[model samples]
Target: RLKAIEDRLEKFYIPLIKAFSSYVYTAQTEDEIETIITCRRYLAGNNLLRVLPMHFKFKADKIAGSANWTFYAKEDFEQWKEALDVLWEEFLEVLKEYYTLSGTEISLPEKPDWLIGYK
Candidate 1:
């Protein structure tokens, strides 16, 4: 079912990538270009802002040996880019899961009874 949603996304959503190209690289006017480009980058499609549920929350726990560093200096661009890529991959995974789980038609038990040794 995950595949089904991904296929749908590829068919329906991914094609927006081309519509964005004109604004990204070749719109006749700056405002027209930036509006579309910004929408493409910041809205319309998926990104950090929409990855997780609004109610899902986490707590930051300090462990026994975990000492807090006062602060760290700025990271190099290369390292920042690597971290961004990692974060983006995680974000994409969330998008993929959201795409799958949002579909009411896609249902599977948390654990199959047969696999659970019941049948």
Candidate 2:
């Protein structure tokens, strides 16, 4: 039972966290990050409903009770963006350290089209 749970977590939960965190790191604009996080429901259509309350302290009061999704006010979204940016920077450093310790070179992964937008 424990091994099955561990396998499921490694296969699904870890990947899901990586995907969401990657989207946040790759997004150029706060709106993009907001869209990535708030646009959809997954796993019982209640994942956000079930999860976001812990840290997204601001309430999307305008959409409360009427909308299926949660959103943040501009000020709140900005705060969230700043927080995510710090986390992304820290995460990159951690990856660099890990690669350095393993004697591997670090390179940026290819981002999605939207993430790599026209330069």
Candidate 3:
């Protein structure tokens, strides 16, 4: 059940982490910060990244609104990158199912006459 929730959460996180890659590697960090900020806003607005445990949410908020994005320490990029990696692996280890089916109807076979109620 935990993983059922996490799988849904990770569907959003992996994409956000992809965006985080740019945040770490982009040659121009300013506009990249802008995009990560915008994406964080959009994901929050859409309520995708907030379902995590509160501590994780704090880490996310910390990274999303990290102080002085325009003049952050070079170390901060790697720090945030490590945070994202931690989140990704945490989710990966917990995601334990592919059995959550949605919006579907299954048809069943008719019961045999010999298979009437045991009573």
Candidate 4:
């Protein structure tokens, strides 16, 4: 579910990017953010639900930006959120110590701009 991915990202993926990006390549870009999103698209498409990835444009512009990854909103969001609430918080707490020692903060952005760009 979503939480599993979040947990995995928090535990493995974030640190992977953090360590890798510590090098010169992609040091300035949000490669971790981009990687998580790209991986999510792959999951939502071929692995998790096998649905078409829709670059969804909301009817109401007031909400925010458009979204590129198509997930089963009601079902996936619910499942993902449930998993996140239970697992991610704990994982992040431990991660915080390592992050601070390294003198950097790794976070999942709330509104990643290119999340809407599928092309």
Candidate 5:
């Protein structure tokens, strides 16, 4: 299902709509992007933004914990940020269509099945 959305994103959405030009807002800060990605990822299920939090959130701690800080230092931050922004824009479009087609409510479940050890 997730792959289906991604396929449609590339095949259908990207070509027909220039989402970036008329896009409402851009990700100005790293934390702004992180929150969007985290919420969207929970719904999208394609795992697009899982690794992005490492770049800006807990960044210093991440570097300190790594064996080679140089690995983190050499990453293309601008490139990844831009890519994520674009992908997120497209993903939101996909999700809108998905919920409309499936008639899903844009609300969290009362008890998410994945929640652990809830009494």
Candidate 6:
């Protein structure tokens, strides 16, 4: 990555990812978990994901509930949490690639456990 590009990633993109990924496990409900996906509107869109270099991408109209799949009263929860958790891993995998390709010699932070906060 170019100096300017990497600097922007460190400040804007990287921090946003860190903050939001932590919330995936910290989240207590489907609503909270959905917000995690909402937070990633930038790269998570199906259209945009196709263009990105990363291998993983959020599928369309699942957590948000697809209109064709069902009507009102449509409901789901734990699945949302699962997708976000997997995406969290997928996202970091891409970043590790980014760091490596850039020759930055940097490592992403360890994933944290905050489910104990349910106390």
Clashes within 3 Å, all models in order: 0, 0, 0, 0, 0, 0
Estimate, for each residue in 1-119, the C-alpha lDDT of model 2 and write its tens digit: 34543443344333433543444332233343343344422311232234332333133322323212134455545444454444344335545554666567788453222211111
Q: TM-score, each model?
A: 0.26, 0.39, 0.32, 0.27, 0.33, 0.39
lDDT of 6 by residue, 29-78 (tens): 33433443455445453533343222112221223332121112222223
Instruction: Give every collision pair in model 5.
Output: none
Q: List the residue pairs that clash in candidate 1.
A: none
lDDT of 3: 0.37
Model 4 Cα RMSD, 1 decimal: 11.7
Report the C-alpha displacement of residue 97, candidate 3, in angstroms: 4.5
TM-score of 2: 0.39
In model 4, state the lDDT of residue 90.
37
Model 5 stretches with alpha carbons more than 4 Å out: 1-3, 6-62, 66-75, 107-119
- The C-alpha stretches of model 3 lying farther than 4 A from their native spots are 1-7, 22-72, 97-119
How does each model score on lDDT?
A: 0.33, 0.38, 0.37, 0.37, 0.40, 0.41
lDDT of 1 by residue, 1-119 (tens): 56655653444333332222222322233343234334434433355334311210121111233221111222322332333344345435546575558754433222111100000
Worst 10 residues of 1 by lDDT: 110-119
Let me know the TM-score candidate 4 reaches against the reference structure: 0.27
- Comparing 1 and 5 on lDDT, the stronger one: 5
Estimate, for each residue in 60-79, the C-alpha lDDT of model 4 and write its tens digit: 11113222232334554444
Task: Rank all candidate structures by their TM-score, best first, as comma-separated numbers.
Answer: 6, 2, 5, 3, 4, 1
lDDT of 3 by residue, 1-119 (tens): 45545444454444444444433433344444444445444333222243322222122222334322221344444455444545455434333222234323433222111110111
Order of quality (lDDT): 6, 5, 2, 3, 4, 1
Cα error, residue 20 of model 5, in Å, equals 21
Candidate 2 wrongly placed segments (more than 4 Å)? 1-54, 57-70, 110-119
